Design a protein around this nucleic acid. Sequence first.
DNA 1: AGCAATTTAAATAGGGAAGAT
DNA 2: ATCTTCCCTATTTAAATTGCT
Lengths: 295, 295, 295, 295, 75, 75
Amino acid sequence: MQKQILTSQKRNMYILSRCKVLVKNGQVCHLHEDGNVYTVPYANTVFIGLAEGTSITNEAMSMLAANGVIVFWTKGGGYDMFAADIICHLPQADYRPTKYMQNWVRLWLDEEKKLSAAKEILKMRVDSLSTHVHDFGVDVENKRVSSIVNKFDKGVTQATSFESLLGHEGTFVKSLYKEYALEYEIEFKRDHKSADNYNKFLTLGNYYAYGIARSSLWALGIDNSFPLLHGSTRRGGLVFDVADIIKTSIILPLAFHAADQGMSNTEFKRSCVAYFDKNDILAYLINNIKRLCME
Amino acid sequence: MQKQILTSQKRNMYILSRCKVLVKNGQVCHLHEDGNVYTVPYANTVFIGLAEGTSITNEAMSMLAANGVIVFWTKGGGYDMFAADIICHLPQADYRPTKYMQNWVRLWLDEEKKLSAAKEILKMRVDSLSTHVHDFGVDVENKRVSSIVNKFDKGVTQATSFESLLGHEGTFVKSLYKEYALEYEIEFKRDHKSADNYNKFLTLGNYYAYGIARSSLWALGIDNSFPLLHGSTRRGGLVFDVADIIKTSIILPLAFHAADQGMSNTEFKRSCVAYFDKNDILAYLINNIKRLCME
Amino acid sequence: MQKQILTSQKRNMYILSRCKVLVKNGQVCHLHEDGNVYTVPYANTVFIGLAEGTSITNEAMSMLAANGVIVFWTKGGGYDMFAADIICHLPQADYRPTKYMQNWVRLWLDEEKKLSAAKEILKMRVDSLSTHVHDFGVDVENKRVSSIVNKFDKGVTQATSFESLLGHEGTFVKSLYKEYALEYEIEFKRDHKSADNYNKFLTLGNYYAYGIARSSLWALGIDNSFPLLHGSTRRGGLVFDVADIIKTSIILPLAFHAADQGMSNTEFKRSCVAYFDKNDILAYLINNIKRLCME
Amino acid sequence: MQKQILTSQKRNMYILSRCKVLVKNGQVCHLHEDGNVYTVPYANTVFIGLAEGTSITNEAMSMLAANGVIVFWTKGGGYDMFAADIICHLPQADYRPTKYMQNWVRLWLDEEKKLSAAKEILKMRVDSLSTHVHDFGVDVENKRVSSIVNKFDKGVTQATSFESLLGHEGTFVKSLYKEYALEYEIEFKRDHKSADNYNKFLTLGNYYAYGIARSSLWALGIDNSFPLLHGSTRRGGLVFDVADIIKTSIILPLAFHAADQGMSNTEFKRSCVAYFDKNDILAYLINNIKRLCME
Amino acid sequence: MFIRIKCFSKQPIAKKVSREVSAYLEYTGNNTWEGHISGQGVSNLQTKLINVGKGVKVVCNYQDKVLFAIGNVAM
Amino acid sequence: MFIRIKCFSKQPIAKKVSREVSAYLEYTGNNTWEGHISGQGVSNLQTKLINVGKGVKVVCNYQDKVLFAIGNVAM
DNA sequence: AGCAATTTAAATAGGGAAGAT
DNA sequence: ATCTTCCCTATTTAAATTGCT
């Protein structure tokens, strides 16, 4: 049975749209409605995503789940300001290791360690914005960005209440939305319905961030149902806490760049794959949720 | 084809085989092999399962998981689970861990509560020996078997440590192996790597014994990695722990009959899902875990 | 298959057809299709020829070039070259433009000397006609053709500048077209973009004349881009210019004799190289380069 | 012929060793002695270096003559001790542009201008060094390289004799060898018989330099036997002026990096095709020899 | 400029493709050609792959996009 | 590691090479797969391709070096 | 839904073989 | 010799379908 390729080293990531995911001749392959099929990985994919019109067979799910593939459905968000519901099937067949949410529910129940873990998972993104730089867009730490990341680190350190973390997080996301609007010279606001290239690409990128994260959390065991930034705006889980670490830092610059230089959907998809593998974004999330867990 | 397994209140757990679960007239439907289209009772389902050879679209799952029914993948009988979501709260306007899991992890934190919970679950080993009685098995009320069940009762009402609780569990399961080998007039040592038929179908049935445990804990929300009797280093220990309820009381004499009549894997799988539906084992496990927590 | 063409006295062009020029037993050889290898002379050959179907190895190339003998490639017949290295003094101990090249540059780089060289190469016309009469067309010593010759032998000697020489050359070309039309009782208007057999056979003979002219300019390293007569923007004007000596004296009657008897394109090729091999007309062209440049 | 790729942006360079280059189904292919053919891009190639143990057919010279391929035969006479003779077959059938030669010979002849241009093929090296930059060798903004190019500048400018320019060129090249020796921390005396990877990659790169240099000679139409810098050490024509520009400024960092990083023979061969086309060391040599012709 | 030509055609109409695409493109393996070309090379190769015949299923990849879709290709 | 697997085999063995190569790479064109593999997925895939059978002709180019050359593959 | 056989054209290497230059 | 155009020969791929899980 050997040892299987590790979850934190899996490379191809998919968001598969309009197909019929099936198994033909022992490989997962998605039947697009041309009559032609494309071979998809099943052992070197860390998630497949399923957009409008896709249909998964059971044997497809068998292969994917056994091999360790998070799967989620894109549509389901019906609100005006939130990505509401991403129904996600985690592979429960393989018994995931115990060592990590036996310590994560320990911090989840004691509210002072829950608060401190909320601080440290909120400094996740301020170190993620520093350790994964770009060669384009904003100067990673210029004047404005350094001012907000210092302001945020001070704000999260002085806050001992959970709605205050949500407030400072909201200012964080909204004012790098503003700063990336100024650096990419456009007027942009977050709305899941706007057909703005930026908005659209950022929605696809947050789907990708969901996946790496959901897979980060399967690999380490931790469920979604044990969040660490719960509140009024955030009703999605831990995924959307570990997912936005690599959204404000990895996704949003990539979405804005793919919006300016005329990238297609598949071009933004491929850019995600490449960049994430190069930065071992998943190895960051599995090896850094870990220090929240047992350290 | 269409199947129905009991759960806490109603028979709200539907297993679908050999049908492309589609969506017709604003309602998720099933298009079978015969050609007949059925419909899903929206009040008699909040759980739905998909067996071998099915398919389900995005417009089917998104509609299906908005009214309150959650999709989970299985092998063929509706117990051996590949992939699923987490049974959280109302999955449209909220995302919280259930009340059912919270009492279990309050049991998990404290050593005394976890000890009394271990006493409880290991007492419903005796209860599951009593309540699922096998005409083709043994008379479980007789003196040679009642000696073993009072051995458990005397041990588990006197146990102060986990290490002696595991030993008393081991001498119980070993005495049931010896008595059940004495009834079929054979010699038997429990080995997981032996090529004899008795061990082969014992381990084979033990797999679906773990499968119903996965289905039962998924349903209560409990992550299968907070093991009571087993150690913290055993991956997915809680599976085998709630499977300890039935591994000696349904799965053991059925596997012995499967190796005593020569019933091969397929015939044994048939007998498994048969007894697993008629005498309601998943419902028995789900109120068993309930009673371990609600008290 | 193997043939010998004279350059000046004993430096000889050895056109090899259909062979395999490889080192055999120390020295070079050429294995033909009938299995007979032949050792090629080293002091009786200086320009070794590679016609159709020949392949030469690097051992043969290097040891042939190391002892004075310099290769060139050619098409079928030995007078349709396409690739070579330039003639130098000697290819081993020095690298210098040849003495014929230097003297031709002195002709090209003085306007009066280029003019007096131009009257010379125009006045080689009469010689070319007289030296090589055919049994096919008009004799040199008739009335009207010698009147055309007398028109050159008067007008070329005292023509002032270059466009006068072009005017007389045009009158001679369009005037022997009249004579060779009267010999074969047809009507001629010279057009290369026509499709009659006379014009297309004349333009094939024109290309065949350009080939040996290019070979004769190559045989002393005389560059092809230094025309006496055509303009400074005419690409390869010296090839046409030293081809015009044979174009109206041998090529024109041949193209016409051929068309009369209505033979084919390959039959044209073999008749051209047969008559071209008989009187060493290549050797005439090297003697004209030496007579033009040496002085 | 159609439009045809120009001889400035053909970008497939080859030195083939131990393989009969033939024509198979209209494709130029090298049949290696193991029995496998490998198709060559005969219309996207500027040169074919026929190294030790190869042989080319006449139909494989007809398809590399019309398509503008510089076929040179490398070893035997090409010991490169004094750069004596690489037997280099230019496709001579195509009548090349003639306004380049009729200006270049004017350069060659008038000695005052020869020196002025000699200086400029010697000033094109510091220009090729400053413009064409690498990211693995040395900084061109370093004080050692600035010092030696300034010493060569003041050597070229005040000298009015060809032996003095030869000595200045000599020391420039030799001290660059020594500077790259000291900065890469390796002894280096460039002896062509020495079989170290530094010297072997340098003499392979010099053959690449000969190939594109002679391609820039052929596309201009300029014959190699008209050298701007002739003397005792410098033999072989002006192709060792058009190669010795890129020799100190491209291939010597490329060879030194290729042997320092342990890159193989074919990997340096690949890198010296990629770089030779990324900043077009071809149309640089084309349009800068066109800057040399000019007047 | 880096292009990559894959010929998803039938074999008698693939040798006729391979005559002309291998004039400009290196053979990298299994009826796929990957190598360097110029823009007028792209125009000439598209023109002389159009004019060879019927069933000339050919896909060209500049970066990760597509350049030609000659024939009813699977892409 | 960006490795590019080309299977120069005959159909009967090639569909089996396709089955285990499809787990780790994606199809690029005409029995040539090309994708990102980690560091040990390439070793697992080499063992899964060695045990395919007799007739496996697979080349694999990391950078431009041949990583593995299972069978009598063409160079 | 997916996996084999299992024919079934049929498309496809391929090995002399005849003409050309 | 070299290349190519052919074609007859096996023979190598491929898609339709039965029969089952």
